[PDB]
Amino acid sequence: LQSVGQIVGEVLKQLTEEKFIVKATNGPRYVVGCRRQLDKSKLKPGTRV
Amino acid sequence: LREELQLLQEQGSYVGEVVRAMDKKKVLVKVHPEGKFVVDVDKNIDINDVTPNCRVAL
Amino acid sequence: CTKIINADSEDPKYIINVKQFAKFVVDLSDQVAPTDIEEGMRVGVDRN
Amino acid sequence: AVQKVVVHPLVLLSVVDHFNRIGKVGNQKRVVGVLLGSWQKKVLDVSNSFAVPFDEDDKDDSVWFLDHDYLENMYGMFKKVNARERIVGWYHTGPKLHKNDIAINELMKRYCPNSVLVIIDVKPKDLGLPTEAYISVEEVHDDGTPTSKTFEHVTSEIGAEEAEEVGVEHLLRDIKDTTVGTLSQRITNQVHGLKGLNSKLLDIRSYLEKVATGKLPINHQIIYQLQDVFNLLPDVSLQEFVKAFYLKTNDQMVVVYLASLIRSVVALHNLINNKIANRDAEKKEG
């Protein structure tokens, strides 16, 4: 009950080491940062997130 | 910088196509995708300057 | 309103499709008896 | 166990409010409360706390009351509001540890096996003492010494999550802050660092005085670490490190010369534009 669920989208681009252009499915697109502990190397464009 | 900071915290205005200036105080305008409303005009904007099918801000 | 989900006075929920909006599984208001509600009739519902 | 205790700037405010609230008439000078927070087998952060009705007697410093049932009831309320936080340890002001700390810690050990004490100093906030965290350990005193309890110091940090950093920032924004570190604030930071080093050195020297005259017993690991520090001091003689001159001169060029030249040339150009614009206006005055 403490989980809130999450959007799902596809990473479009790596704007910089922190800013990721990410498109939500059937919705708008954002620039969003990643979690503090994550494998940015595996955040290739097109990777569903 | 402070003025820009202040004005940058106010919400954006919807653009809309005015269907027609109904009255001297009311204007029928269609804004995508909410639909069509009959808005009022603030003090600065003159009604006679409002012409049909012109993009206005709400 | 859509399938009755076989209420039998213990599961009175029905899934209803609000037009181009979503569909929700909901329950009745106290003012309507289940006999008045059946699959495929237009029903007016609250918003939350 | 725990190698770090992170204290959010809300248990700090909670402690300060508790201290003022009691000390309106509560001249025990030292108040005790319970601090909750998310637990980790790694760095532990604390995010909330409450204050239990505590009493202490200066006689023998062993007679005291901490309302454990009140502790349980507040913890029940906080769990109902936010079950994510569990009891992590207990705090008390009065930066001088009394005798009950370990004993009281024992009482806290039943509600939290790895109960950490966190002294949150209120009044003295001169240089670097926001909070100090201790954890009880099970060893007599050393390899060859009698029994004791011997709270161990743990590194403590102050950190906030989002929607709590915003409150701190908003309460701040006096003439303070300026997160961008300009040269003046950096030199001020150097001065503050020298002050802190001098203060720590004076504390160590006071301890060595209290040991040399026999007021304090010899702590062997203290002396061992003093020897380690004294040996760790580098040497600015030995003309191989003196070739650090090299990089200092290297620093100079990029800074100093180049930057100055550019700054000086830009200022001179700005003077040309003004000395032109002024004569333009004067000639127009025609």
């Binding site: 922190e18 800013k19 252009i21 919705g27 708008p28 697109r29 954002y30 620039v31 969003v32 940062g33 | 910088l1 402070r2 820009e4 900071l5 004005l7 940058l8 915290q9 106010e10 919400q11 954006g12 205005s13 919807y14 653009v15 995508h32 995708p33 993009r55 801000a57 | - | 924004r173 802050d177 300026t178 997160t179 961008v180 300009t182």
Partner: protein, 70 residues
């Protein structure tokens, strides 16, 4: 105070930001932008943005809660 104001302006460019299309420039500081949420907004352009980089249909990041062309 100038340092603090610059810090605040830079902070307004934080994340997340919604992507939109720079439909049309209206004034030196205000534009019309089509946010990919599917909606056209009359918003205010941040000064530090390079004006020559503002071309029609260019992708622009807008403030999440104000749609200001960040």
């Amino acid at each position: 105070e100038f340092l603090h104001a610059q810090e605040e302006v830079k902070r307004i460019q934080s994340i997340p930001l919604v992507i939109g299309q720079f439909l049309e420039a209206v004034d030196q500081n205000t534009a019309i932008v089509g946010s990919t949420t599917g909606s056209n907004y009359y918003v205010r352009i941040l000064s530090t943005i390079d004006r020559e980089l503002l071309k029609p249909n260019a992708s622009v990041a807008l403030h999440k809660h104000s749609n200001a062309l960040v």
